[model samples]
Target chain A: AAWVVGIDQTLVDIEAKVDDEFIERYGLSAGHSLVIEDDVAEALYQELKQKNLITHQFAGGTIGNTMHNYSVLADDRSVLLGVMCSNIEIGSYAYRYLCNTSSRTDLNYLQGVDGPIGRCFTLIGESGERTFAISPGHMNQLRAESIPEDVIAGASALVLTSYLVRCKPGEPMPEATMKAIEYAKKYNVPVVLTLGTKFVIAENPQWWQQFLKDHVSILAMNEDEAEALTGESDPLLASDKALDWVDLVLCTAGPIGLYMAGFTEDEAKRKTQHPLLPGAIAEFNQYEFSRAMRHKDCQNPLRVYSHIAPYMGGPEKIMNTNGAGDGALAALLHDITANSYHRSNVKFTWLTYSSLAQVCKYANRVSYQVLNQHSPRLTRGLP
Target chain B: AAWVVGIDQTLVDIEAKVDDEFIERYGLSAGHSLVIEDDVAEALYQELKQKNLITHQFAGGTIGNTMHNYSVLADDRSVLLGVMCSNIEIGSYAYRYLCNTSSRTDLNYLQGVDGPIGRCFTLIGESGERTFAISPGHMNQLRAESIPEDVIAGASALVLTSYLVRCKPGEPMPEATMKAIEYAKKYNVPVVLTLGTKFVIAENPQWWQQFLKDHVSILAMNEDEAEALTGESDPLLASDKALDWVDLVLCTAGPIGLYMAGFTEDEAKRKTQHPLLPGAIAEFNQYEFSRAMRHKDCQNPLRVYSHIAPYMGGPEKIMNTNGAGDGALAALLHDITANSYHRSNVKFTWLTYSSLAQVCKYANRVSYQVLNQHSPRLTRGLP
Candidate 1:
């Protein structure tokens, strides 16, 4: 019965490994994401097709990736909002996206339009740097009017990414994101914001901090995003600084591991059974085992934090890290959904049976599974 | 710009070529549909899995089947409302269902839920009679609240199946169907109902008549269903009974061919430019080129009819008849959407440019394409 909702740019991710000359020939920035015009994109697609440079093609988008992962982990509901091809073909990008995702990802609120969904060309260079050449097809056409109030009212959380709000002027994507936020805020549904990459935050750090304060209840990011948001190079310090603006924070620092931060009533902070960890904020995880609650929910909200190293010291041969962070966030959301489900169904279920600390452990483990796999998404097994 | 919507019981049709005793051992009723319990279905599934009795499995729902065909033929939008598995694994039934559908079939409207949607045991006996053993899984969990008004409002028609209403009392399936019907009425969207089988209509003819009288604008059925609903064995006579309740009717009589009936303004009825075929109704295709309209929309309501024999005698060797009628209805829907789209876009598009008579020709042609295929659904070139 528990469910999460999302707003995504419905897209297919096509991977192509190319050299520097190919990047220059296409006029693409080495590491920045650029939205390509239809004419240019069509030409590029044709070139890739003719040259047989394209490796794989499937559904893609930061918001879409997380929803697919969330549904897989929880075996629960995850509603999505976006625009789809009004006239889709047998083997088009839209078809691939639908066929690839979990059915638990609810697609009921998608707006329909007369064009193709976006296509992201993840062109990787020899150095492992990625330049995203995106074809923003009809993915940004989700009108504000199409975001249903009832679907938003029935969500455990509303998920979105920086890319959703990063729109061209006069586009509906930004307006639709605001409308989603309005309903989510009114209904007290947690707004989980993911800074897809540091580029999103570095674009305007001051604006992002205020944005987080006004809307985001839960923030998921990585070392780069943390630094951009809090002006602290040290990820642990960055996470500590972020807790001031957001009620909950999930920071995945590549090697140092993942971090979880939240609040619990001072009298209710359950001590961890494991050895206390020392960090920039000494004993930061003293209450790592305590359940998390909103600052407003706790009688005397006490900040709680937890951290864990990579599962089994990281994958010996990390195949790829494409969706590892997205995978981790999905595991975290799965735990949140479980918490809400149990509370609504049982009379006296433990409020913090599966705490934020436990979520970190599961998320860390799940990320490794995705990291070591052929794809960034979970393909092999359980958390 | 025109679209159709459907409320389906998401299921995978698992066909198995079995004998009488194999069917009897499962306590299945021959030539009738029965709901199988979870334990029984699981055990049978395991046995079949071990013995490799299963031939193929793909998404199947009377309404869903029609929409997939509709989307393909129209190359336009067809939204669906149904519950699907939340966490679909690789090679899972739900995955196969999504992968096998037309991308033009908008799945974003599908509700998500835990557990498998449904798995239908399509057992074909030595006698060639088909018996259905269905496990109704999450298909029945589509709550009325999940039905969106805007989706129905934007549709040219709302499609439903008799099986959608053939549920146990107090189930969400019936309520959801009523809700979808309500939206279609409020928006003046035509309600297209397909009688699932002769057995469904035969079980209670009076109820179906009243159901059609109250809501259906267009009705699609096979000859057997026509006979069951009207008490008249002749499909042509049965269509007469049907026209009293519904404004438009599509009747597919296997070998006898396909039939269409609707009201046209007296001045609007175009005389058949082609030869009129003699049948039970006597020159039934006199208005074979006349367009269809609701009785209320016609100044001088003229009941027009059309009929066509199967294309090239339905293939030299008929492969399967699973979704021939469904394909025919889809072709019919394609013309309706085309008419609507042209009228709305052009300055002076001819009103009723394509007639119900022309529709029968195209529909008949499409059905043969399906009948000649290995599976009920079309898997070859587009019709």
Candidate 2:
């Protein structure tokens, strides 16, 4: 069986305009501007083409965003496939308007009738800025039958965005995601689902709960989204609710680190504990204490307490935090899947912690890596 | 010079109140809850005693949170000092009452000189479910002027949390934080300030702005807090504004990743980029088209995009996020001072991406170190 699979919305990115104002207004200090000098643009284009990462147009949407970002940092063997509705034209203004306006409107545009109506372009840049561009081409309409059978058939696992899944308001999973998940299940492939936004979860709680129950092997969500999904204000509770259904549930608590639940009962039982106090005392009779005794006991311990664990150390500072959740997610999934099948061979506890550190390391590697590639790691099991 | 400093609010962690019902109502899952049995507590205390990690307890406050968490993950040689307020009895009761009643009256009772007083306790537990408690002693009473002269006298650096700086409605910083900063400046010691709550920032904009200008050599803030501090809705803008004031500003975007700004101009330059597209182009075309093209041109060339960036990977599953910000802060500072200073020769990149990977690896290690101290390496630097 294949080790890892990535699934998400694919789109064609074409540069129609440059958002200098937005960039300046928002103070996006660290990224090449969309408005490249003609020379710079041509040079970049040529470089992208040589690397076989060039897209036909300007940019792609989230899928392209993910691909472009990952392409830069991933190793050579990593391959990214874009799964999309063949009829959706990513380049057309009409399509853009439909997709950009509202989820309902986008769903309305994708409903009903036949054949390959559009094509999405996958561009891999020299620096690994991978992207995809969708061209409306001759066909502007998408029917259930219009999705490319091979795209769905070829993928070992699917990474689905909530936008695509809930494209149709009434329908929870879009036809394509649903079909892809079914195909994976038919092959016994694992499917990972990301709770995209709080609004999305709030809008379709039933769909999420049901989808997670049956199709999802791995569930990914942030503290807020988890809260939204389980209707629990606390992140841990939300994760527990999610874990009840999936074999592995990963909860990203932003900078706090990740919480993962996936292990046999025996493995979980092996978890050890360190106590702050030596023995359990039923009660302390405060009334029986004298002032001198109280002063001695209450005084801040004169001896400095040394830490038993070695990992914690350092000064405190925080920079830009645009994609910490995604980074953690990528790392957690990669770590879990990397060693999930080899449970008997390798002691994965260290490996698991190492992978987690890698996630955090990459999360702070560079502004863009930290910003664009929310998570970084191959699906799992590979390397 | 002190090797480490810890900061966080010290709460009377009511361990007895821990139960499934309480957990459920509080939205806490097993992952977030520390359910200690009586036996486990005894074993851990024995271990701590053996290690000689226990020290005198001071009146613990929020900073204590940072200290305890770090101490649990720190090395035997590393010395950590916790600076806490002695006169916290009034404030403690006030906070507890506020938690229960959710009323301004409770807050007021703690603010005035006639506020009621009480004893404070620091609860300790073991991983196997053991419990123990120690009274901090009679709540020491100290006014703003009564802060220990020596505590601020010989310090190498100071870590300040906004909570200490916040005062009642019209007040700015508590006298202690102000005094601490003054002392640090007098000694030419650098001060690191963590912007805690948006509510606090909003309430004391002038104080924060001036604080940022004066003693803030390093600033730590999450994405939301940064935005609130600058009144900038966008992440990029908030970062830019933060950079203007401090030599190093670490802004953490939940799930996005940690964005850091440093003291050197080159460091700042490394993080800055040209605008994505010119404003003129965006104004003439649709936002999506312009946006798409920018993405295509800028993103399509990178190979390890997600690896180098944090946001591209997508969202993460969230667990308990109670201490994530502090965790990240600890990691960043720890890496820069303890490790990076000795290893790398690079002037601009304080830590290389690979080194960053090491930092990430250590972050969770440190966190787990604090959790149970089950593993000793949790506090040690990378192997």
Tens-place lDDT digits, model 1, residues B1-383: 67888999998899888878888888997777788888999987888888899987767778888887776565456888898666544346765688566645677667778767788888888888888889988788889998999999988788888888766667798899899899988978889899877876898999999999999998999888999899888888888779999998999998888888888888867889878777788787788788888766777888888888888663477777778999988887788777778777862222234787788888888988888765666532252
What are the per-residue Cα lDDT tens digits for candidate 2 across B1-383? 23333222322332222334433332323332222333444453354456554532222243434433343233211222221222222124322222121100001101122322222222222322222232222112224463334554544346667755433333323554567577767865457778765655777676787878877766778777887799876554565566566655556665555544333222121211323322212211111111000111232221110001242245544322445556655665555444323433332322222232334445544433333322111112222
Worst 10 residues of 1 chain A by lDDT: A346-355
lDDT of 1 at B339: 77
Name the lDDT value of residue B379 in candidate 1. Answer: 33
Q: Under CAPRI classification, how is model 2 graded?
A: incorrect
Give the DockQ (2 decimals) of all models.
0.04, 0.01
Question: What is the per-residue lDDT of model 2 for residues A259-316, given as tens digits with 9 covering 90 to 100?
Answer: 4444232222221232432212111111111111101122231111111111212433
- Residue range A110-163, candidate 1, lDDT tens digits: 777887788999998988888889899778888999999998887888899988
